[model samples]
Target: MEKAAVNEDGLVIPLIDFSKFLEGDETLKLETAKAILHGFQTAGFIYLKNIPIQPDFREHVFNTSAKFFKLPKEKKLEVGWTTPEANRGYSAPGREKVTQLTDPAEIEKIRSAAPDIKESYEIGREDEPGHPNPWPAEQDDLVGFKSTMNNFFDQCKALHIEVMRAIAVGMGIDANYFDSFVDVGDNILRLLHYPAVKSEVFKINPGQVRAGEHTDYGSITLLFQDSRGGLQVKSPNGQFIDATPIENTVVVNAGDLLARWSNDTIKSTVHRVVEPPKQEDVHPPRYSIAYFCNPNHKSYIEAIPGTYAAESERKYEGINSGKYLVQRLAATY
Candidate 1:
């Protein structure tokens, strides 16, 4: 059956042309900024077009990601979860614990079921890896893979500055308002490759999911994914809406921190990746990269000055950033 195309919550999400982010021309920038502001305030999510990253670079990283995850059991084992904090290494089918929401019995069922049809490798700033990125020893170009991914991270970091500016306008604050919190913050980037799974056999319990449904912990998340789509978002009307990322576009979504920061004027959308169908897909074994842009953990996350005044009664009483984030870190990857 064909799925619905509308936003589940009745929000009209606008797609922004990213070129406006780079052009220094004042008029163009203002229009772009205005559009971005509206989306952030109303929908809390937007699609950015014309992302301009090197195609070869993206293709190479994606192909290599698939190769890395498709390695034999022993090969993949070389990078298996090293420490409980080693959330950035090779995770086999049964290792991930994040999944569906409900009662304990429901959560247990989801956790024990077949994992979402994929294996992933998560990486971030080399300085923070603490442990080495598990590269296949026999594979001569493993280091190249890490290097390419790191390069991609650099590109995303550069774009994040403009994103901050957009958010500033979105929240009716100075363009650089987000800077204080973001400068030198600890952020996480992940690369996920979802393999095909038998649709008929897929389960709903906690143990069986690509990822459980949850809101992000960061300020914003920039996601790039292959064409074969499995991303579904829940609507306010209690139905699922499929979200697809177009070519060269990053799917940007609000996270819990920002939602809390805005006193809920803006909301963090809850989303997840469902298990892939057993049938052949347009893109075999999907490849996706998600950049979870965050601010320094110590930085405060609360209603922006304008948010409280504009809304009158604060949507929420303030909460501690460190505590809120730690719980989220434990819940989602």
Candidate 2:
């Protein structure tokens, strides 16, 4: 096989089919393990395909998310910015603002940053709506939707456990080495409903960016996106690109924590959601749910000794995963 090129755009992204991860197929599994490990080594990101789940689960999520966003603006505002610290609850347009680019006008959006083009309700492994969730008195099925999403969360966690076990082994550690750190679980499952932007005129310059450029703070992120393809990741070379992720394929990428723990072996690429460019206004908005698979807060991030011995300049001073993750949260609004 020819080596992948790291063109001016950095490195081309790799697409890994789920079948490559089957349990008994050590041959295929090993191949995938090597590719993923290499991806981290180069770009720190990869799009993952294949996972078993009922269609209704995804359908229900999108439908419910749309329903939540359609609620009266006042109703949604009731829960707006509830848990700013947790960054897990409902965020209305303008309430939260991020202007990653340096264009001076971008600061106006930041100054005037309304919630977002979307409104969403988010939760994590803790299992309860944090201080941010509003839980309207009349939305009877909120519980049902919450229940289903939580179930999906559990399933994704199981898959992360399986995938990371191999990651640990690939690093030459006992498969269980990283397992204990994850067993305690500090995962975050965020559901977002970007508001409709029917007016093409609202499109900001260099627009179509829903979220700003930043790397994940967790170890890994598993994402489920609707047909609308707004997810863009920067390669090592700085070209912003999209993953033609297959259907039911969960796009997984490394976060800051993993890049640090694995030393520089894994690349944690910068990524952002481009708001639709003005010309693309006719296109409908989007909905997405992402599960950030992170280690327990107490886990320490450092290069495994064995990897360090093999690769010079690989280790960094240890940092408490929990504390570092929290510090990033403070940087944002």
Candidate 3:
């Protein structure tokens, strides 16, 4: 097999057919798993294709997102996240400041500098802490916002489970190895809106990036992004490359937790969003949906056996998923 390459423009995040991994014959399943393992080791990102989502589901959720973000300031703020601990509800622009996952200095640098220029609405399992989404009132223009989002959330949740199972297979673990941990996991679905930034005010602050470079904190992240495209991924060689949106494909990337479990065999590449380049600058808003699939709060996070080479050192010690998540979320706001 040819090794994937990372170039000046960034490596292509491989695309894997979900259907093949889940429903195909044993040979096909092994091939799919090998492909996933390769992608994870090389880039930590992949484009999941042909999942079971309805075509109209994406359109509906995106339309609903537009309606929600367009609401009056007072209304959106009415449901704003009560506290950093409550990781649910709405968050106005400049709320979250993305930071380096492993460096304290880098984390504090961004937190004290500038916040990421984005607004978001978060939803979680109804049974989880700080859940039961604080949906906006149904107005004439936004009559179906709540229902559309709720439905979309359920779809994404199912996809997350399916993907986790496929990942377990790729790692030579029981297909259902992640099922228990995720059965009651504290997963979150975030609707993001990156407002237009004028070039003059875009990167004024040393930390003015839309989403400062950082690796995700949970097990994996599934993203649905529109074509406005400013997402970038830092390659192994340290060059930031474009992670441009591909229509109808969900961008899937391994997160810190997954990397820990895999003993760093699966890379958690750093990524961020920035102001569009001059020629591509239309100042258009960028909308995206990010599903952060975490494990159950009590689930243990540690490297699984066989993931590390005999002489290689393990990269992480075990920790409680919930506590780690709270600590990370608290820093975001």
Candidate 4:
């Protein structure tokens, strides 16, 4: 097998052109899957290039996101997150202490230092259970916010399905192996806003971070971020490297569920966003959209047989994805 290439940062995580898989020869498709598989095994992250996402579609979502955040505090809070069981709604700054999802001892230590300074709005499939997404009034600043976001969600979901099929091929399984499992999956699309550091509104805590270190809790996460980048990933050697913005690309990362299904063949990387260095700190707010592709509630996730040699051993038991998802979601809040 060919070795995966590294970036200028001397880190793993290659840029994969997904267009070939869509329009090229069978040989090219197989090679693309191999590169994707290697990326999952090594860095658990990859830069997806040549995706079929529409540029204007993304622009509308980003612009609408800004409009949502600029609404009055009282208006935004009207749809504030109600409970862990109903995890769809607005989340205010400092409301989520992500470190609490870690080990108890470490959670306390991290919480005492600083709180994460990001706010977000979560939305699931329109008819999925739990609280409904909050939308601004028709005459408000965000007139077409709902329609635009729904369109973007559908687009991302379609690409997510294609990526899953590619991953199945990479694992030597039937191309549609994951089809039934994610056909009506309980996925999430989040619009995140990190206020400017210089703003006194959110009462910035000493040593506060934008987002705490943690791994995603689904199968795969697709992220679209603005140019103001602070994303970082923990390398295999435990070094931290910046995952800065790249033009015409979306960031793709495997999550905990995928790692479990692959029996650790694919890593679920830990990443975080920190306070910018003093010299480089600016006042512009940052925005990003993350789409988490979770499996169907009852899909059984376990290592596929024949994926490993006889000498290799399985390290996880089959899990009911629905039950597992609720537990993980409850832990974050």
Best by TM-score: 4
Model 2: how far is 64 from its true place, Å?
2.7
Model 2's number of clashes is 22
- Candidate 3 differs from the real structure by a C-alpha RMSD in angstroms, to one decimal, of 5.0
Clashing pairs in 3: none
lDDT of 4 by residue, 236-258 (tens): 66777778787667889999998
In order of listing, the candidates' clash counts read 14, 22, 0, 0
Q: Predictions ranked by TM-score, top down?
A: 4, 3, 2, 1
From the highest lDDT down, the ranking of the candidates is 4, 3, 1, 2
Residues 271-330, model 3: lDDT tens digits = 999876535444778898898988888898887766877645887778988888888888
TM-score of each: 0.81, 0.82, 0.87, 0.88
Where does candidate 2 stray beyond 4 Å?
1-10, 83-85, 93-116, 127-143, 202-208, 275-281, 310-314
Segments in model 4 whose C-alpha atoms lie over 4 Å from true places: 1-10, 95-112, 199-206, 276-278, 310-312
- Write down the worst ten-residue block by lDDT for model 2: 1-10
Q: Is candidate 1 or candidate 3 better by lDDT?
A: 3
Q: What is candidate 1's lDDT per residue for 206-294, written digit by digit as tens?
A: 34556667778778888888887777776666565667556666788888888878777676887888654335423255688888887
**At residue 278, what lDDT does model 3 achieve?**
34
